[PDB]
Design an enzyme around this catalytic site. Structure first.
Site, PDB file in Angstrom:
ATOM      1  N   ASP A  66      -8.485  -3.146  -4.900  1.00  0.00           N
ATOM      2  CA  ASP A  66      -8.035  -1.741  -4.837  1.00  0.00           C
ATOM      3  C   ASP A  66      -9.084  -0.774  -4.278  1.00  0.00           C
ATOM      4  O   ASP A  66      -8.739   0.212  -3.611  1.00  0.00           O
ATOM      5  CB  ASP A  66      -7.602  -1.242  -6.219  1.00  0.00           C
ATOM      6  CG  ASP A  66      -6.125  -1.393  -6.452  1.00  0.00           C
ATOM      7  OD1 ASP A  66      -5.331  -1.095  -5.531  1.00  0.00           O
ATOM      8  OD2 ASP A  66      -5.757  -1.801  -7.572  1.00  0.00           O
ATOM      9  N   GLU A  97      -4.400   3.823  -4.612  1.00  0.00           N
ATOM     10  CA  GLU A  97      -5.313   2.675  -4.652  1.00  0.00           C
ATOM     11  C   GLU A  97      -6.646   3.002  -5.328  1.00  0.00           C
ATOM     12  O   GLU A  97      -7.038   2.333  -6.287  1.00  0.00           O
ATOM     13  CB  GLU A  97      -5.575   2.098  -3.251  1.00  0.00           C
ATOM     14  CG  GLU A  97      -4.352   1.724  -2.405  1.00  0.00           C
ATOM     15  CD  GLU A  97      -3.435   0.657  -3.018  1.00  0.00           C
ATOM     16  OE1 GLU A  97      -3.308   0.573  -4.247  1.00  0.00           O
ATOM     17  OE2 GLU A  97      -2.789  -0.076  -2.250  1.00  0.00           O
ATOM     18  N   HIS A 101      -5.338   3.466  -9.268  1.00  0.00           N
ATOM     19  CA  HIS A 101      -5.386   2.049  -9.634  1.00  0.00           C
ATOM     20  C   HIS A 101      -6.779   1.561  -9.972  1.00  0.00           C
ATOM     21  O   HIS A 101      -6.995   1.039 -11.070  1.00  0.00           O
ATOM     22  CB  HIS A 101      -4.806   1.158  -8.539  1.00  0.00           C
ATOM     23  CG  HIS A 101      -3.360   1.410  -8.252  1.00  0.00           C
ATOM     24  ND1 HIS A 101      -2.694   0.797  -7.212  1.00  0.00           N
ATOM     25  CD2 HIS A 101      -2.462   2.231  -8.847  1.00  0.00           C
ATOM     26  CE1 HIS A 101      -1.443   1.219  -7.189  1.00  0.00           C
ATOM     27  NE2 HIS A 101      -1.277   2.088  -8.170  1.00  0.00           N
ATOM     28  N   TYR A 105      -8.664   0.566 -14.161  1.00  0.00           N
ATOM     29  CA  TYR A 105      -9.364  -0.616 -14.665  1.00  0.00           C
ATOM     30  C   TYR A 105     -10.604  -0.238 -15.441  1.00  0.00           C
ATOM     31  O   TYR A 105     -10.921  -0.893 -16.423  1.00  0.00           O
ATOM     32  CB  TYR A 105      -9.733  -1.605 -13.558  1.00  0.00           C
ATOM     33  CG  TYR A 105      -8.557  -2.084 -12.739  1.00  0.00           C
ATOM     34  CD1 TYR A 105      -7.508  -2.788 -13.324  1.00  0.00           C
ATOM     35  CD2 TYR A 105      -8.500  -1.827 -11.369  1.00  0.00           C
ATOM     36  CE1 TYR A 105      -6.416  -3.215 -12.559  1.00  0.00           C
ATOM     37  CE2 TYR A 105      -7.423  -2.243 -10.604  1.00  0.00           C
ATOM     38  CZ  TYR A 105      -6.393  -2.948 -11.199  1.00  0.00           C
ATOM     39  OH  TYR A 105      -5.327  -3.374 -10.431  1.00  0.00           O
ATOM     40  N   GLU A 164      -1.393  -6.856  -0.930  1.00  0.00           N
ATOM     41  CA  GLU A 164      -0.462  -6.176  -1.844  1.00  0.00           C
ATOM     42  C   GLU A 164       0.431  -7.142  -2.641  1.00  0.00           C
ATOM     43  O   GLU A 164       0.649  -6.967  -3.851  1.00  0.00           O
ATOM     44  CB  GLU A 164       0.456  -5.198  -1.072  1.00  0.00           C
ATOM     45  CG  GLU A 164      -0.265  -3.994  -0.427  1.00  0.00           C
ATOM     46  CD  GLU A 164      -0.624  -2.893  -1.432  1.00  0.00           C
ATOM     47  OE1 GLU A 164      -0.339  -3.035  -2.656  1.00  0.00           O
ATOM     48  OE2 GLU A 164      -1.169  -1.850  -1.002  1.00  0.00           O
ATOM     49  N   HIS A 201       4.464  -0.688  -1.959  1.00  0.00           N
ATOM     50  CA  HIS A 201       3.438  -0.647  -0.892  1.00  0.00           C
ATOM     51  C   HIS A 201       3.569  -1.841   0.051  1.00  0.00           C
ATOM     52  O   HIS A 201       3.467  -1.682   1.261  1.00  0.00           O
ATOM     53  CB  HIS A 201       2.017  -0.676  -1.457  1.00  0.00           C
ATOM     54  CG  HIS A 201       1.637   0.529  -2.252  1.00  0.00           C
ATOM     55  ND1 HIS A 201       0.364   0.712  -2.742  1.00  0.00           N
ATOM     56  CD2 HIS A 201       2.350   1.612  -2.640  1.00  0.00           C
ATOM     57  CE1 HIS A 201       0.309   1.850  -3.408  1.00  0.00           C
ATOM     58  NE2 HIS A 201       1.502   2.411  -3.368  1.00  0.00           N
TER      59      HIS A 201
HETATM   60 MN   LIG Z   1      -1.218  -1.102  -2.818  1.00  0.00          MN
HETATM   61 MN   LIG Z   2      -3.353  -0.782  -5.868  1.00  0.00          MN
END
Ligand SMILES: [Mn+2]
Ligand SMILES: [Mn+2]
Ligand SMILES: [Mn+2]
Ligand SMILES: [Mn+2]
Lengths: 290, 291
Positions: A66, A97, A101, A105, A164, A201
C-alpha cells in the site's frame, strides 16, 4: 446555430463507467479511527507466539504494498491516463492507499504490539527477499511508464491489477481466517474495508488496461497476453515462497496457496483474460471472514 | 534500492501528523450543499455583477485544475517521507475529486451550458489570468529530480497560489456571502478556501525545511527569488483586479485584500510581511468569519 465546444466539465461522460466508480469510491470513504481497536486486545493476547508473528509480518507486507501503491503506482497511472474524471478517481484511490490503508495497519500495530516488536517488523520488511523482490518488480514496471506510450502504461496497469487483486491476498488470508472464527474482529473489520476498496480498484484499473489492449493488432495482443501470463507466473512463484516462509509456522501454507490461486484468476478476469488455475475448495472459515 | 513501509508509530517531522489530522477531519463533498436556492438571489444581480462572478469563478476553476493535475502531485513526487506523501496525496485528492466537482456544480446551477463554454473561452484567452497561470506552471515544470532548490522554488509558487493568487477571486463570493447573497455557493467557496489555507500553510512548512538547510548566501538568494516572484505576481494581480472589478466599483478594496493575503503567504514561508497592515472590507470579513 453551431455551439461553442465543451470545456472539460462534470456533466459529460468520458466513458461508460468512470462516474459510477467515482461515486462508489467517494461513498466508500472511511478512516481507521472510526473503528475502536481495544476490543481485539484479549483475542490477540491469547494467540500463540507463532500466530502473532505471522499476523504482524502479514500486515507489514500489506503495509509495504500500500505504501508503494499510494506513493508511486496510483499517482503515476493518474499522470498518464487522460480525462479529468478518470484522474479524479485514480487520485482518490491513491489517497486511500497511503492516507487510509497503509496508515490503518499502524493503528492495528500500535494497539496490539509494543514499540520494539513494531520496530522489528518494519526492519524485517526491509530485509525480506520475497517482499523486496515483489516490490522491485511492481515498482520497476510503474517507473518504466513512458509518456504517450500506451504499451508501457498497459504493462504497469497489469502490475497494478496483480497487486490489487492477487498479491494482497497472501496477506488478507490471515485476518479473514481469524474474523471468520470470531477472533480479532475489530482489526478484521478494518481489513474487510481495505479489501472492499481493493476489489473496486482492481476492477477499475482492469477496465483501463482492457481499453489499451483492445486498441492493439492481434499479433500485439498475443504478446501482451504473454507478458501478463509470464508476469503472473513470476509473481506467483515468488508468492509461493513468501507464503511458505510466513505460514509454515502456523500450519496454513497449503490453504493460503489455494486462496492466492483463486484470487489470481480474479485478477486475470479483471484484465479480460480466462482463468489460469483450476478451481479448489477454499477454507470455509475464510469464506465466513468475507 | 531497499523498499520500506510507512510506519505511522514514529514521526518523520514535527508537524505532518498534526496536518494529517486537520486535513482528514475537514473532509467534505459537493453533494452536501444544495445549490438550487441561489437562483433566488442570482436573478436579482445586474449584468456586471453576474459577469464578474462568472469570470472570477472561471479564474478560480482554471487555477485550481493546475494545482490538482500538476502542483500537488509534482510536489508529492519530489518530497521524501511516507507520511508527507500521504498528506500531499490527500490534498491532491481534494483538488481533483472535491474542489473541481464543486466549481463545476456552481457553474451548472447558475449558467446554461452555452454561457459556461463562452466564459471559459474568454477567461482561457485572458491576458492576466494566463500570465499568472503560466508563471506558476512554469515553476512546477522546472523541478529537477534530487534538486531541492528547484523544489523550493516550486513550493513558493504553490504557496503563492494557495495563500495569495486565489484571493483576488475569493473576494467576490465572500462579498456576496457577507451580504446574504448566493449563500449556498458562498458556503462551498468558504469550504474550498479553508482547504487552500491549510494547503498553503503545509507546503509553506515544507519550503521552510528546505530553506533552513541552506547557507546564508543561498538563503539571501532564495529570499530575493521569493520577493521578486511575489512582485511579478502582485503587479499582474493589480491589473487582473482592475480588469474584473472596476465594472462593479470594488477594485480599491480588493487590492487591500490581495496585500493582506500576500502577507499571509510570506508568513507561511517564514518570511516577514511585505506590505503595511490594512483593514479589510467588513462585508468580506463577515463572509470570512462565517461557520
Ligand atoms: Mn488499491
Ligand atoms: Mn490499498
Ligand atoms: Mn482547490
Ligand atoms: Mn489547494
Amino acid at each position: 446555430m453551431t455551439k461553442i465546444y465543451d470545456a472539460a466539465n462534470w456533466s459529460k461522460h468520458e466513458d461508460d463507467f468512470t462516474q459510477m466508480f467515482y461515486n462508489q469510491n467517494v461513498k466508500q470513504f472511511w478512516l481507521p479511527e472510526e473503528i475502536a481497536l481495544n476490543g481485539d486486545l484479549l483475542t490477540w493476547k491469547y494467540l500463540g507466539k507463532n500466530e502473532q508473528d505471522t499476523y504482524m509480518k502479514v500486515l507489514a507486507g500489506l503495509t509495504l504494498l500500500d505504501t508503494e501503491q499510494g506513493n508511486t503506482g496510483m499517482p503515476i497511472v493518474a499522470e498518464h491516463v487522460d480525462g479529468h474524471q478518470r484522474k479524479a478517481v485514480l487520485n482518490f484511490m491513491a489517497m486511500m492507499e497511503n492516507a487510509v490503508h497503509a496508515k490503518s495497519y499502524s493503528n492495528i500495530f500500535m494497539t496490539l504490539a509494543p514499540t520494539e516488536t513494531i520496530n522489528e517488523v518494519f526492519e524485517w520488511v526491509k530485509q525480506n527477499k520475497y517482499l523486496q523482490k515483489k516490490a522491485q518488480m511492481i515498482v520497476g514496471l510503474y517507473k518504466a511508464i513512458q509518456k504517450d506510450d500506451e504499451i508501457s502504461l498497459f504493462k504497469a496497469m497489469v502490475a497494478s491489477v496483480y497487486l490489487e487483486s492477487f498479491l494482497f491476498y497472501s496477506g488478507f488470508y490471515y485476518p479473514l481466517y481469524f474474523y471468520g472464527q470470531g477472533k480479532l474482529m475489530q482489526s478484521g473489520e478494518i481489513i474487510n474495508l481495505i479489501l472492499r476498496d481493493e476489489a473496486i480498484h482492481g476492477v477499475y484499473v482492469g477496465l483501463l488496461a482492457q481499453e489499451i489492449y483492445n486498441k492493439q493488432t492481434e499479433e500485439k495482443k498475443a504478446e501482451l497476453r504473454e507478458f501478463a501470463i509470464d508476469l503472473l507466473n513470476q509473481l506467483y512463484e515468488n508468492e509461493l515462497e513468501y507464503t511458505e516462509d510466513l505460514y509454515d509456522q502456523v500450519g496454513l501454507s497449503h490453504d493460503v496457496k489455494k486462496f492466492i490461486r483463486y484470487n489470481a484468476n480474479k485478477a486475470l478476469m479483471n484484465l479480460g483474460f480466462d482463468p489460469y488455475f483450476e478451481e479448489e475448495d477454499i477454507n470455509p472459515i475464510v469464506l465466513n471472514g468475507l
